């Protein structure tokens, strides 16, 4: 659930998922169109695509479990949806980590109209 994806992001990036990745670029937090502005935005785009593959699950509210084995995120057995959801988040978090170096503040609170273009998953 959103509580876990959040905590996952913090451990990983030391950034509060709430400011930092809730209104970044075109796909971070809401968002449903245009061209990702950068890596981090690409990450969100993929994450959003990842959820797209689970039509009958509920990402934002279904909770799951995960442990860390030396920092390695490990999704634990739960429901089919929960496992799959946990995997999708896991990826996003790593993605975020991997692009911290390009995180740009100018992409926080990005205006909607600047998100032009089309992109398929």
């Amino acid at each position: 659930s959103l509580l876990e994806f959040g905590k996952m992001i913090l451990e990983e990036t030391g950034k509060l998922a709430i400011p930092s990745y809730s209104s970044y670029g075109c796909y971070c937090g809401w968002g449903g169109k245009g061209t990702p502005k950068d890596a981090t935005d690409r990450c969100c785009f993929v994450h959003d695509c990842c959820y797209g593959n689970l039509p009958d699950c509920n990402p934002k509210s279904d909770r799951y479990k995960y442990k860390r084995v030396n920092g390695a995120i490990v999704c634990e057995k739960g429901t089919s949806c929960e496992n799959r959801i946990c995997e999708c988040d896991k990826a996003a978090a790593i993605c975020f980590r991997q692009n911290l170096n390009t995180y740009s503040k100018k992409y926080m609170l990005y205006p909607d109209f600047l998100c032009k273009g089309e992109l398929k998953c």
Binding site: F5, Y21, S22, G29, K60
Partner: peptide, 4 residues
Amino acid sequence: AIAS
């Protein structure tokens, strides 16, 4: 609230 929410994350991505």
